[PDB]
Design an enzyme around this catalytic site. Sequence first.
Site, PDB file in Angstrom:
ATOM      1  N   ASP A 512       0.784  -1.210   0.000  1.00 39.35           N
ATOM      2  CA  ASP A 512       0.000   0.000   0.000  1.00 39.35           C
ATOM      3  C   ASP A 512       0.831   1.284   0.000  1.00 39.35           C
ATOM      4  O   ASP A 512       1.904   1.371   0.603  1.00 39.35           O
ATOM      5  CB  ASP A 512      -0.973   0.060   1.163  1.00 39.35           C
ATOM      6  N   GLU A 513       0.270   2.301  -0.653  1.00 35.71           N
ATOM      7  CA  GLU A 513       0.731   3.674  -0.628  1.00 35.71           C
ATOM      8  C   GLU A 513       2.195   3.930  -0.931  1.00 35.71           C
ATOM      9  O   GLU A 513       2.843   4.802  -0.321  1.00 35.71           O
ATOM     10  CB  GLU A 513       0.376   4.233   0.760  1.00 35.71           C
TER      11      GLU A 513
END
Length: 858
Positions: A512-513
């Site tokens: 993620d991210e």
Amino acid sequence: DQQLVDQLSQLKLNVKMLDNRAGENGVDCAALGADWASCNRVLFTLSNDGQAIDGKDWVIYFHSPRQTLRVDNDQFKIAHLTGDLYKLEPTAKFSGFPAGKAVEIPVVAEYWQLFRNDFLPRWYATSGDAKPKMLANTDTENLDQFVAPFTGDQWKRTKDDKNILMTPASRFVSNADLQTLPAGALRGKIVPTPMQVKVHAQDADLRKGVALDLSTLVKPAADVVSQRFALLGVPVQTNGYPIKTDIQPGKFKGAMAVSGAYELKIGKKEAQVIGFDQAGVFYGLQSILSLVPSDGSGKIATLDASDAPRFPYRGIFLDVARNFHKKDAVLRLLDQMAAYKLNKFHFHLSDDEGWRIEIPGLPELTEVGGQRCHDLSETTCLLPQYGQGPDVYGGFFSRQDYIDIIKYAQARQIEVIPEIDMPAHARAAVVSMEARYKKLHAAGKEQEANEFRLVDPTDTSNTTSVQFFNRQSYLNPCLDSSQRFVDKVIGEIAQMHKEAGQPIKTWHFGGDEAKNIRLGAGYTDKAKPEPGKGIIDQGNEDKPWAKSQVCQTMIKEGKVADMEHLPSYFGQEVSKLVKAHGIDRMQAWQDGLKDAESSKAFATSRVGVNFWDTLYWGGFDSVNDWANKGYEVVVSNPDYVYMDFPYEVNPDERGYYWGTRFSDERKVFSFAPDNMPQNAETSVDRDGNHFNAKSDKPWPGAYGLSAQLWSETQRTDPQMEYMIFPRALSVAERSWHRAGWEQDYRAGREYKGGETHFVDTQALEKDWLRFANILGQRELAKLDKGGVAYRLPVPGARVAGGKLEANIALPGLGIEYSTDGGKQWQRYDAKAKPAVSGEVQVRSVSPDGKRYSRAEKV
């Protein structure tokens, strides 16, 4: 020196919200570099009850989830260190903290701060010599000590916010469709709802105990059941009501021929559970236990049921990295999961702010990564985050603790899925491996020093993570040392699982991210500023690893196309390592795999994605693409199943709220995970607005459902419990049982909130009414017995015709009222309502009578 720090430590802080929409009221947020030109004005007041504080050799450190953009008292200045850590310092104009006076420091912050929980405790002071000391009034979990109450419309995000503020009077209205059902209506009601049940008129009597035939189960699993009967007051004795068990896989066909399926027969003289497997026998026993009443009567309904899970993956995710949660809290959570048939525990063991698992041969991961403290060199600790104070704060699971947890989950039919997040959200690992590099390098052991190093020494990339860390938050996916590290960590954790008797089935890569937020859409460049956007210097902003010489040569040898594809490439590479350790399933947050062709690009035969796009933003259509590319979709939508978000729209509630403003037990229950468009008719977006949803794409179905507890503001174990329970019971229901009001997906059908009427909301409402009653009248009393500090809802109340009328979100729970400023509390009786005059306050009480909700005035 120490005297200066001692003086500063005695300053009393007061925090007051001034304007949550400063951009609407004359502040040029864009010029201050605020994302989407959104900013707020807050007042910090520092009061001095002592003698004048005139030294200038000091720094005050504080935490905030928001970036400070401007300081409006020129005697002070605020600078960011990293993450959530900021520093307040005197400027050359500073003329002291006067004796007996208050100094006011107004600041402008990015975005908005809609909940008092946004303000973090444990401000601390430093000065040259001295040991850091906290500002004493801030050393608390009680925000009332330093944060003023919100007033007026300060809870609103924008002038157009359509959310409804919850007070006793408006809550009364939201709860008014609820009523207390007679005990007779809750007869034979198993939770989660069974696929098929036929309730009979006779009852079985369990008062003298049960005689359990648990021959079908391994001892540890049988011990769990026996203990749980005893917990709910049903003694196990040979002369008791006989409960017989058997495993018969051959009696089950098609989609009922799955793990956890069972046939249950409860008769007047004996009960029988026939499972497809051991999980199935275990679940049939948890169904009987779900029927045991909380009134001491020991009677349950005779019935015939046949059951099987709608999804193979029914998960709870727990973040222990942001803030640690003790082994005992983890065990309590696993008990409750088993009771409601949740079978997947997604264990987020690492992130930027902590590393929580002991790894043989890499001691620095826990020695450094496992604790935070005010150590600017980050040689012994990671820098403080999240308002836990300046002193050592941390913890980790030893190898034996971890093995204990796996054995405990295994007895409960729960699969432990370890997550070691990469390539972003990896600061604890990166900084720990830098402390390791330095240490070994000092001893002249250069090859050992570089073996597991997660940094390219050439890399000068300027990149900002979601939590405002810089390039140390990103492990370098191009290094051979990084692959060595992953391999080592996979190896060591796979060995613990083998020792525990539950070999890893799924490795969670994270993913993620992995991006630079400063290159996002709400920011604009200083040179050609678009209106409505935060004006920053974007020309000095890099994509992650852009300045890494090692990643550049990887792009040149043709391995990866561009820098943006690195996260997905790295996921493919990690799948090979996962496969090489005998693990045939990998899972990730979907954004980490967005550039892979399809599930075919991975070495494991199974690839799952935690799908965490919001629906009102388009998630109802983008989910189809993952399922159609071969991934197993684990529905994890933040707008419904993020448990770090608030229960209600009230500034005194706990939680973050980026994905939605609230998700209560009722909202979670109403989520339809297998027909995502239909949620447009039964819910509102983050600003309380109706939305529309349609997909024209094929939908083969979801593989599972997961509810997430992220731990930013869940600093303590009781806070974690408050946030997960009781709304995880709604998750258990929806992940096991497909309701009648959950329609089949139809390509091209468009659901329009407030306009279409496709969904059978009367059926939904009736289902919820029953479920809410089962919680308030039976199940919350069992949570009390399991020692879980679940959230007690505040009552709804109104004054009408001279008397108090009160209601509650979970009917059956006790209600108390006070007419004297909350000094004397009396029990509310609905069939003999109290005559009331003046100020009235209300609160709820737990079934065991020991705990109370927060009190509010009508």
